Amino acid sequence: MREVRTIKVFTTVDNINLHTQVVDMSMTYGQQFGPTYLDGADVTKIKPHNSHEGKTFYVLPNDDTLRVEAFEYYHTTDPSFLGRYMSALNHTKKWKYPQVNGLTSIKWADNNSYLATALLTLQQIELKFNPPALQDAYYRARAGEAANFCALILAYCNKTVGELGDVRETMSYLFQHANLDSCKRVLNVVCKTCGQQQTTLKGVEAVMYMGTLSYEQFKKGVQIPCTCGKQATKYLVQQESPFVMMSAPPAQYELKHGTFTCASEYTGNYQSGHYKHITSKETLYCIDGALLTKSSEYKGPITDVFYKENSYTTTIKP
Ligand SMILES: Cc1cccc(NC(=S)NCCN(C)C)c1
Ligand SMILES: Cc1cccc(NC(=S)NCCN(C)C)c1
Ligand SMILES: [Cl-]
Ligand SMILES: [Zn+2]
């Protein structure tokens, strides 16, 4: 064969901006591009095919044009992000995403129940992501194709497919990448020996609390240790957010219809467990991936409860 036989392909980091390439079919993609992927699959050690003509390949950002695009799209500089995203995508593109009670869920696979619950929660709270990658993928998940959204969640949370996940920790990562700058929380803490003390929390900190599942109990007061050695009380002074997340180590808890938005239930230990999702609508639905049951009341090992909010100020006279 005289001269090199070639094909035209496009490389990308964000799957929107394309970069024309002529590739030599006698060499692998890795020899010509560095690590290369085709819709999640690692083709780095593969030589081009005629069927590859015109297709888009993900590559790592090795030149300043790809770097600017990658960061603008993903808001990250982690050198392994894009590989980790493609590894996850190769699995999540195979998962199933059924509509359960009007929401996009995920049929159980690969220990993914924490992702199912996280995805179902997102569709019930008001949240705008900042990274365009997350906006595009979330919009597409809402409509049914969550494969890219779930791979991105995995990649942002630095969990690989199959690894144990926490819903609260995942929610925390996603909240970091969301506009919550309009959120504010004022707390006060009362100690018999030490006195009063107010604290103001902003952004993410201000919509997550660890220690009680009850927003009522949070408004009324909760007991905590003080530097002196005694128990002090912490109560909510003011709240400004479209939702609040209350979390605590899993514990038997009664979910009362119409008193909360949705919740996470965790059964197991630190080694091994399973998440179910409970949403309060016309009744209480339990969504367990593809599975759906209902009940008028619920008692279970609850670990996260989501409530909604706009503005709240305490009637407690300090
Ligand atoms: C995608 C992107 C955009 C802008 C800057 C950087 N960061 C770089 S290229 N910094 C040093 C190399 N380390 C990553 C190992 C990465
Ligand atoms: C250290 C700590 C403190 C408070 C809450 C949790 N979260 C838990 S125990 N969640 C259960 C699901 N994970 C085990 C995968 C962990
Ligand atoms: Cl968004
Ligand atoms: Zn004290």
Author numbering: -1 to 316
Reproduce text from the manuscript describing this model.
The main protease and papain-like protease (PLPro) are responsible for the cleavage of nonstructural proteins 4–16 and 1–3, respectively.
Fragment 5 binds in a different orientation to most other PLPro inhibitors, foregoing interaction with Y268 and instead sitting in a small hydrophobic pocket traditionally occupied by the V70 side chain of the ubiquitin-like domain. All class A fragments displayed some degree of inhibition of PLPro at 1 mM with the most active fragment 8 showing 62% inhibition.
